[PDB]
Amino acid sequence: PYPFKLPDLGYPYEALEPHIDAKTMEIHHQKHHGAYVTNLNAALEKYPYLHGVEVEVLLRHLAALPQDIQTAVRNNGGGHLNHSLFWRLLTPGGAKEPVGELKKAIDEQFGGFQALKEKLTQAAMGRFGSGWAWLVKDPFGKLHVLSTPNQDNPVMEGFTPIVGIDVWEHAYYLKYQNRRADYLQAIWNVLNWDVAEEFFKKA
Amino acid sequence: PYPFKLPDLGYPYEALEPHIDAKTMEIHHQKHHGAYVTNLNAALEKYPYLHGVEVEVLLRHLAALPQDIQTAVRNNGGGHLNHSLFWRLLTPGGAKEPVGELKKAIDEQFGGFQALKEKLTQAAMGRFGSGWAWLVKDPFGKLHVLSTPNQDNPVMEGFTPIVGIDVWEHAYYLKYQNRRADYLQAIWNVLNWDVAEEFFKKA
Amino acid sequence: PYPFKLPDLGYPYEALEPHIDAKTMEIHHQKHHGAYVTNLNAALEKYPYLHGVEVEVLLRHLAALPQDIQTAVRNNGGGHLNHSLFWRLLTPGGAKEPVGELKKAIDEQFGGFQALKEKLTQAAMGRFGSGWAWLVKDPFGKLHVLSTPNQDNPVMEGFTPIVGIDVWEHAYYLKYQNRRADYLQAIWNVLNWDVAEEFFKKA
Amino acid sequence: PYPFKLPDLGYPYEALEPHIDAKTMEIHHQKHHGAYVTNLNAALEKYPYLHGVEVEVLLRHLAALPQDIQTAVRNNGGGHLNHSLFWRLLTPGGAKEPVGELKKAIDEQFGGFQALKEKLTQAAMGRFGSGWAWLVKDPFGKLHVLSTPNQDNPVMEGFTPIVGIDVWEHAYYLKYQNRRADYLQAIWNVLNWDVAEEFFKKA
Ligand SMILES: [Mn+2]
Ligand SMILES: [Mn+2]
Ligand SMILES: [Mn+2]
Ligand SMILES: [Mn+2]
């Protein structure tokens, strides 16, 4: 709850080379995610009555929040939640293909990992402007591939995110420039499916 | 859960005269609410996996529903939920002013019943086209006055409805025609605050 | 331009019996349309620099209007324009089927009157809540059938309206109650296609 | 009209150093804008009846375009028009402050260049995600400062663009990383106000 904290990456900024550059990892965590946490805190400071609430609860009830902080919480709260999930998913050393219960769900609803990789790529490439591509779970057991604009998080619509891929240009511009496709091809080498499995099971 | 049922009014169609006419009460319940229940059921028939879900759960996760029934559930599910709350709120013989815990909340957040009546009237009058005016509760204890378009229900945004007022023209046209203001003046004579208190407490 | 005036209806309130009742014609014209004109004028009253502009132009440039009157102009200016067209299209004494240049376009593009009636009926029935169904022309010479919510007029999006059918409940509730389909069957008996032809030629 | 062409940039990629880096100018023009032109042409290729229309007209009539190409035209046609204006406004050798008729309008309406810089800076900084900040004119002779998301161009809403500043991360990431504010301070050093003056006169 408030005051929110910037989580440590938990690994060196250079750990994902040559897939994502150390310079991006550092700026992406310290400057972009850092700003989101600071701004989120700045917006909630004025309202003591909301200090005991988890960010996910704030995002599901955005319409209830005072009108002067709705946008600030959506943007920075979403920014904080998305990136926190992202750092965890990039943790080095985990399985490079789906495993466990998430694997079963994937093979059963999409056909196999190759089919899911095509849908998520199609979703990430298709998101015009800034946004995230996601594999989400709904309360009825169904998996969905979708994209959201800017820092919007699927929890706002009642989904539970399992995998999220950051497609804002700041995520890949320094190393890939306009080549978002090459950035997505590299992301598959670094996603930690054991972490995705933890997210799916708690889901 | 599915198959949904049209609830009985629980009172004679003529019980609210001369405030709302018996002919409207009958058409409003049998034809309008009846159609919503039928259409809601028609849309869910194709998806066995959703047959054990309460309408409120369906409405909070609209984005998860198959794309071919999202609109049908929003419109008819919302229509079913709104009118079901409405018939209960019009039950004859209850308190004509807020009472109990809802009263305390009202006097504390709005100043008193007269101030709440001005905000809800302003909200009902201000809803252009079809819609509902509502007194809702959020998870943080705050009361809000808002209006929604068509058959949208505040649960879609994470609120719990306490009082809802139907401002579609079919609710007042036969007796009041274009005079929505006169219809709202009459509604205060028939709202059951003991029922509103039941809704608030379970909220 | 400003000050806007209620147009004459042009024929006796009872001219369209038994298809549309006299009472509806009186209230629809004097009370509903009378209210839109009054409210539009009140909005524009505080902005002299907008006094010599036709309503079509204001609607095409809603985003440019002062912030405090954009909704008022969209809703009331749209209401004024929509009903002004409607009274003319209902003028007694014209062709009951498409004629002339509009007929050639309909035959070519939709296959004939029968196909268009069907499409226009589907658009009217499918407009949930308050709204209008339209046959419009775009700058490229193509015809489209679409519906708009509340009092939105298709000029807002660049189209030129040819035929508009009011589907707000006030347009049919006194005579038809919930039976919007019976109202639509009856409307074909009163449309004036010689008027539709002028709208088509002129744009 | 179709086929659309990539406009010449007009000056060496390094002409705007040290304010905008040469590498950004090359990629922005050849790769980003080159992609928008290619994608726009591919969309319009299957619709000959739209071949002699200027891009401004297509954007004003998006709702009239075939359903399957509306997004493609909005995004790529908007991208083509936005950047075409941008290259011209960055032409070396013009006035660094407003001049002529546009200067009189700015002085009258905003109080002077200083006040406008401030307003334009606020709009650019406040555009969350991808977008553009603009100084536009409406048909009524008034100037507005606003921002649009992604590649939306203000002609979609009836405005005539005078000054547009690209705030997508690709416009500033190689040199400035997250520091959008430093990029905006630098942009004032390269804007060409003689060009802005022509855009203003011409509309
Ligand atoms: Mn990011
Ligand atoms: Mn109703
Ligand atoms: Mn009407
Ligand atoms: Mn750009």
Swiss-Prot record, chains A, B, C, D:
It comes from the Bacteria. Transmembrane segments: none annotated. Signal peptide: none annotated. GO terms for cellular component: cytoplasm. It is an enzyme of class 1 (oxidoreductase). Its EC number is 1.15.1.1. Its cofactor is Mn(2+). One of its GO terms (molecular function) is superoxide dismutase activity. Keywords: Manganese, Metal-binding, Oxidoreductase. Binds 1 Mn(2+) ion per subunit. Destroys superoxide anion radicals which are normally produced within the cells and which are toxic to biological systems. This is Superoxide dismutase [Mn].
